[PDB]
Amino acid sequence: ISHGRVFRRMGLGPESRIHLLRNLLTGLVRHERIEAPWARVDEMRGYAEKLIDYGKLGDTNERAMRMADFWLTEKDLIPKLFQVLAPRYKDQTGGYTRMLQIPNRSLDRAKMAVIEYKGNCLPPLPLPRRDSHLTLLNQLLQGLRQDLRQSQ
Amino acid sequence: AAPKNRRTIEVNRCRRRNPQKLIKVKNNIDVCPECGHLKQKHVLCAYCYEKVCKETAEIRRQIGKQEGGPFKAPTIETVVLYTGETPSEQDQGKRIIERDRKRPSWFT
Amino acid sequence: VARYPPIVASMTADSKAARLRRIERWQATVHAAESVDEKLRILTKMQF
Amino acid sequence: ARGNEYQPSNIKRKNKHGWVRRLSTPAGVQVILRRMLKGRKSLSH
RNA sequence: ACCUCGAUGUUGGAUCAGGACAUCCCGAUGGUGCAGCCGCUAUUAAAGGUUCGUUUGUUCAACGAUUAAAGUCCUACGUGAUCUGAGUUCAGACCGGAGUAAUCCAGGUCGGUUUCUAUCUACUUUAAUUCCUCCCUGUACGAAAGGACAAGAGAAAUAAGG
RNA sequence: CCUCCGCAUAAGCCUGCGUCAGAUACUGACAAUUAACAGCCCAAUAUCUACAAUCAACCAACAAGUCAUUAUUACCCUCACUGUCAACCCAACACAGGCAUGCUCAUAAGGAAAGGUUAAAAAAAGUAAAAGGAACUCGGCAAAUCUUACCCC
RNA sequence: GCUACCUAAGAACAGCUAAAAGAGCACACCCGUCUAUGUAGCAAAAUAGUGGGAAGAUUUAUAGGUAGAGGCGACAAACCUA
Ligand SMILES: [Mg+2]
Ligand SMILES: [Mg+2]
Ligand SMILES: [Mg+2]
Ligand SMILES: [Mg+2]
Ligand SMILES: [Mg+2]
Ligand SMILES: [Mg+2]
Ligand SMILES: [Mg+2]
Ligand SMILES: [Mg+2]
Ligand SMILES: [Mg+2]
Ligand SMILES: [Mg+2]
Ligand SMILES: [Mg+2]
Ligand SMILES: [Mg+2]
Ligand SMILES: [Mg+2]
Ligand SMILES: [Mg+2]
Ligand SMILES: [Mg+2]
Ligand SMILES: [Mg+2]
Ligand SMILES: [Mg+2]
Ligand SMILES: [Mg+2]
Ligand SMILES: [Mg+2]
Ligand SMILES: [Mg+2]
Ligand SMILES: [Mg+2]
Ligand SMILES: [Mg+2]
Ligand SMILES: [Mg+2]
Ligand SMILES: [Mg+2]
Ligand SMILES: [Zn+2]
Numbered sequence: 058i059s060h061g062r063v064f065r066r067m068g069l070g071p072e073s074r075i076h077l078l079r080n081l082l083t084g085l086v087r088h089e090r091i092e093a094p095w096a097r098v099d100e101m102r103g104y105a106e107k108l109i110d111y112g113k114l115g116d117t118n119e120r121a122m123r124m125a126d127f128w129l130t131e132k133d134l135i136p137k138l139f140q141v142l143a144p145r146y147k148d149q150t151g152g153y154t155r156m157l158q159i160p161n162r163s164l165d166r167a168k169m170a171v172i173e174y175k176g177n178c179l180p181p182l183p184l185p186r187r188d189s190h191l192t193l194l195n196q197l198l199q200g201l202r203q204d205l206r207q208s209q
Numbered sequence: 210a211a212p213k214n215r216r217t218i219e220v221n222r223c224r225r226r227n228p229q230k231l232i233k234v235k236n237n238i239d240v241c242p243e244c245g246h247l248k249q250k251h252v253l254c255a256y257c258y259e260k261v262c263k264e265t266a267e268i269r270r271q272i273g274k275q276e277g278g279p280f281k282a283p284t285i286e287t288v289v290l291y292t293g294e295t296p297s298e299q300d301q302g303k304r305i306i307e308r309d310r311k312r313p314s315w316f317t
Numbered sequence: 318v319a320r321y322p323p324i325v326a327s328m329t330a331d332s333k334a335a336r337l338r339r340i341e342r343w344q345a346t347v348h349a350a351e352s353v354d355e356k357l358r359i360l361t362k363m364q365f
Numbered sequence: 366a367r368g369n370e371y372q373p374s375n376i377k378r379k380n381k382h383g384w385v386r387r388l389s390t391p392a393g394v395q396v397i398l399r400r401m402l403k404g405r406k407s408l409s410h
Numbered sequence: 411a412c413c414u415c416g417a418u419g420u421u422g423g424a425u426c427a428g429g430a431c432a433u434c435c436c437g438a439u440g441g442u443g444c445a446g447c448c449g450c451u452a453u454u455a456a457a458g459g460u461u462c463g464u465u466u467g468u469u470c471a472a473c474g475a476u477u478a479a480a481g482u483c484c485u486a487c488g489u490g491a492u493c494u495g496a497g498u499u500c501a502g503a504c505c506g507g508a509g510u511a512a513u514c515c516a517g518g519u520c521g522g523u524u525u526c527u528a529u530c531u532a533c534u535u536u537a538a539u540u541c542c543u544c545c546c547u548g549u550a551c552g553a554a555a556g557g558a559c560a561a562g563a564g565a566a567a568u569a570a571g572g
Numbered sequence: 573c574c575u576c577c578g579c580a581u582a583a584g585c586c587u588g589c590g591u592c593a594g595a596u597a598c599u600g601a602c603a604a605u606u607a608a609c610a611g612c613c614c615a616a617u618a619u620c621u622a623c624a625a626u627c628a629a630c631c632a633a634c635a636a637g638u639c640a641u642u643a644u645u646a647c648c649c650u651c652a653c654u655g656u657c658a659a660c661c662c663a664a665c666a667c668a669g670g671c672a673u674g675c676u677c678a679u680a681a682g683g684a685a686a687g688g689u690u691a692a693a694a695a696a697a698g699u700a701a702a703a704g705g706a707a708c709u710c711g712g713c714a715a716a717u718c719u720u721a722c723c724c725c
Numbered sequence: 726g727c728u729a730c731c732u733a734a735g736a737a738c739a740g741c742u743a744a745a746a747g748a749g750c751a752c753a754c755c756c757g758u759c760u761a762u763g764u765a766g767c768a769a770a771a772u773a774g775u776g777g778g779a780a781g782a783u784u785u786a787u788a789g790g791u792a793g794a795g796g797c798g799a800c801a802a803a804c805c806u807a
Contacts, residue, residue, distance in 0.1 A: 065689090095688090122321075132322045159253055160253070168689070171253070178306070179269075181315070182253065185253070212529035279334055331573085367663090369671090369727080370728085371662060374583070375584085377726045
């Protein structure tokens with residue numbers, strides 16, 4: 058029975074789970090785009106958002122500095138976290154990460170996903186785009202909208 | 210426990226050809242409008258993703274060459290500039306990664 | 318006012334930089350050793 | 366616990382089943398003769 | 411001595427229990443050497459229940475405290491491809507005894523390997539009982555001793571389901 | 573993140589993750605380990621050799637102990653041979669076992685428990701547990717604590 | 726070349742308490758008390774925990790010796806290539 062359990066059981070235990078997520082998140086902070094098993098990316102997305110929030114908190118915040126020191130195993134990324142990512146997202150309030158499924162791993166056919174920080178310098182992902190507004194159905198719905206607006 | 214009798218090929222065929230065993234046809238496959246290769250609707254296109262990954266690998270190799278060593282991550286934003294392209298006012302004050310090729314059409 | 322942690326390699330990781338940092342830890346113990354006897358002992362104890 | 370009863374050592378090997386020891390006694394000479402008659406490629410050890 | 415010795419694993423316990431009624435308790439009923447309270451006996455009733463401990467391998471027995479009661483059995487003395495091996499005539503050993511000795515004793519005692527990944531069958535979500543408290547009541551009954559029913563009210567305990 | 577380790581010698585094995593090319597830690601070819609380390613010794617005939625070791629000094633010993641030459645005769649005039657690799661041996665196996673010694677006594681050296689997901693039962697290992705504290709059980713087995721006294725042999 | 730015993734000449738035994746000890750706690754090392762797992766297993770006797778000894782009647786590397794009407798044995802009819 059796992060009603061309400063929100064954390065996956067990963068690695069060799071709770072500590073190993075935290076360390077795996079920490080390594081994935083350090084890689085994400087360094088490269089701004091990381092491909093990894095789908096479940097691990099899903100688990101680490103929340104921690105990535107939380108680091109962005111802690112970076113928003115600021116350098117002077119000792120709690121934020123301690124959190125960054127723990128979570129970024131490569132200490133050169135803490136200045137990055139506090140001076141490149143948080144300033145980038147200062148305007149935003151959330152949704153700093155884009156996660157998209159990827160064709161299964163060639164080795165073990167594992168469900169993989171790519172997670173990136175939005176606005177990175179890397180080439181854009183082939184994002185799935187909704188159907189154009191000029192399609193038949195979309196044009197009919199536009200006619201509906203125009204008729205309703207004219208009525209009101 | 211050991212089998213009491215050999216199970217016949219008829220029973221075995223029943224078991225291993227029960228539709229629960231058979232592979233299910235997938236109806237979520239579709240053509241990628243960009244390159245025309247097949248892709249699952251929810252999954253990203255393999256061909257396009259490989260294009261992006263190879264371009265990312267080139268850019269990252271240039272990034273590593275410019276960094277010159279471990280633990281040298283910049284404290285400023287980064288911009289990738291291709292041949293025949295000059296930094297803009299926004300690009301000013303950002304680390305320039307120069308790629309020795311024309312900017313990909315998909316890349317913007 | 319911002320106390321960034323030092324940008325050094327991990328002392329326990331499996332990497333070239335980590336190995337160099339462990340070598341630095343060894344050499345720091347050698348430096349901290351006061352007596353020349355202790356210095357020589359630390360410098361020559363590992364037989365390779 | 367068992368199985369590793371063979372603790373190899375060339376000194377013991379040659380002193381127990383060598384050509385010299387086999388020829389030392391008439392019985393070992395007959396052992397070598399039997400091996401030769403059978404056509405063994407290895408008369409002694 | 412009829413199946414099984416090209417193996418049907420066999421005491422007691424744990425676990426889960428299916429069934430019988432020749433009913434231990436709860437229900438109804440006849441008789442009584444049934445005044446009442448306890449009882450005894452017989453008919454009907456197997457829906458439900460039928461305790462925890464000390465020594466002992468004990469099943470049982472005795473004892474302690476309870477209970478409404480702590481039922482008799484069958485089920486390979488149910489159930490070891492679910493479990494335990496304390497007893498129990500494998501290998502070691504001691505005591506008493508037998509024998510010249512080897513060795514033995516339905517004598518004691520200390521120790522002593524519990525296999526199996528399930529092919530088939532079968533199966534895997536099918537209106538509750540009881541005790542006690544008060545009151546009736548110190549009433550009916552009875553010389554006293556003692557001492558009820560029924561009705562009513564309240565509390566619980568267990569079982570099932572959440 | 574782990575580190576029982578690890579590096580050498582011995583013993584064992586005998587080219588057994590060096591390069592190239594083919595396949596699909598395999599096959600074929602090419603290469604390699606260079607002695608100072610170690611092994612491989614000693615001209616005779618007699619003749620000597622009571623007094624441990626233990627920091628050898630006090631002491632204490634008992635179980636009474638690895639460590640020595642002289643005399644004469646011969647004799648120099650001319651640095652060979654062999655081991656040197658490896659991820660390795662004995663266990664039918666890339667076997668959780670066996671495996672001597674010197675250093676390292678936690679490491680400078682050596683390694684990776686997780687193929688991916690889910691987080692059903694049963695099973696194994698571990699941790700925590702209201703009140704109680706052996707009522708379990710053959711037996712305090714196990715676990716937790718660190719705990720008295722009496723018997724048999 | 727295992728094992729029983731022996732022969733030659735070797736090696737090992739941290740630390741603490743005590744003091745010249747078949748002394749105590751305790752590593753390495755040797756063993757294998759009890760539990761669990763395993764039972765075609767990692768293993769034709771192992772693993773984890775726990776435990777006995779651990780300066781001695783100790784453990785152990787090398788070479789040699791005793792051979793089946795036998796050897797060897799602190800007798801368990803032990804061990805003598807599963
Ligand atoms: Mg897992
Ligand atoms: Mg041996
Ligand atoms: Mg018969
Ligand atoms: Mg007859
Ligand atoms: Mg049969
Ligand atoms: Mg009846
Ligand atoms: Mg019977
Ligand atoms: Mg028994
Ligand atoms: Mg006797
Ligand atoms: Mg017994
Ligand atoms: Mg015992
Ligand atoms: Mg069993
Ligand atoms: Mg089963
Ligand atoms: Mg692994
Ligand atoms: Mg798995
Ligand atoms: Mg408790
Ligand atoms: Mg008891
Ligand atoms: Mg007690
Ligand atoms: Mg009991
Ligand atoms: Mg115990
Ligand atoms: Mg000592
Ligand atoms: Mg002692
Ligand atoms: Mg005897
Ligand atoms: Mg006997
Ligand atoms: Zn595409």
